[PDB]
């Protein structure tokens with residue numbers, strides 16, 4: 189019987205290419221548009237991924253939809269942080285192998301302020317020397333990081349699935365073979381990074397929502413993203429979102 | 438409505 193972490197590993201989506209032509213000069217508008225198109229394709233792959241996470245398909249179909257719609261930005265920004273961590277280590281934002289925010293791209297107007305919340309994710313993964321097994325558990329936990337204020341239809345099963353992956357994160361940490369005290373510290377550090385993703389996402393969604401809503405910017409989103417964005421905007425407005433935390437404020 | 442996400446979740450794969 190395979191281990192649960194090996195099952196999470198085998199379903200990890202293959203890295204997608206942006207289809208960005210390097211022979212054409214850069215513009216922030218061109219990069220934003222290309223990234224929205226890439227994001228749509230990454231979200232189609234994220235649906236196929238979530239369906240293969242052991243336990244996910246046992247939740248009510250409405251809960252499956254709810255979790256993907258709440259967590260979509262957290263999943264993209266976290267996987268982006270991982271790719272940036274593995275690829276550069278310098279570091280740069282590595283959206284796709286053909287679309288990296290290199291030093292020349294960083295000179296675009298206000299580029300650092302547009303990238304710093306995402307660069308923080310990769311910087312922390314690097315600082316904490318997060319492993320591939322820890323990362324797989326952490327990303328699954330991000331899919332399970334927000335619920336409606338009144339809860340899910342399959343709340344008991346969701347809590348059991350969530351606890352299972354918290355314990356899986358524990359197993360990955362123990363492999364770093366530190367003492368009981370070092371394991372507790374590492375669990376605290378990794379779960380603090382998980383909590384900080386809610387704050388990273390609020391910044392990214394402020395940008396995403398502004399560019400989606402302001403039609404005078406001529407910033408296109410593919411159907412996959414436009415559908416999730418259209419669904420999420422009223423939920424943020426009416427406070428129908430419970431952000432789950434490992435550490436109380 | 439969320440037609441596309443529902444379909445991706447309902448279809449095989």
Ligand SMILES: C[C@]12C=CC(=O)C=C1CC[C@@H]1[C@@H]2[C@@H](O)C[C@@]2(C)[C@H]1C[C@H]1O[C@@H](C3CCCCC3)O[C@]12C(=O)CO
Nearest residue numbers: 220223224226227264265268283302392395396399407
């Ligand atoms: C999902 C997204 C796509 C691919 C990926 O790997 C990771 C992500 C997570 C962040 C997602 C990204 C894209 O949509 C584009 C988004 C949605 C972005 C957050 C916003 O930030 C800006 C910046 C990103 C740095 C380069 C300049 C533009 O682009 C966004 C936007 O609002 C554009 O309208």
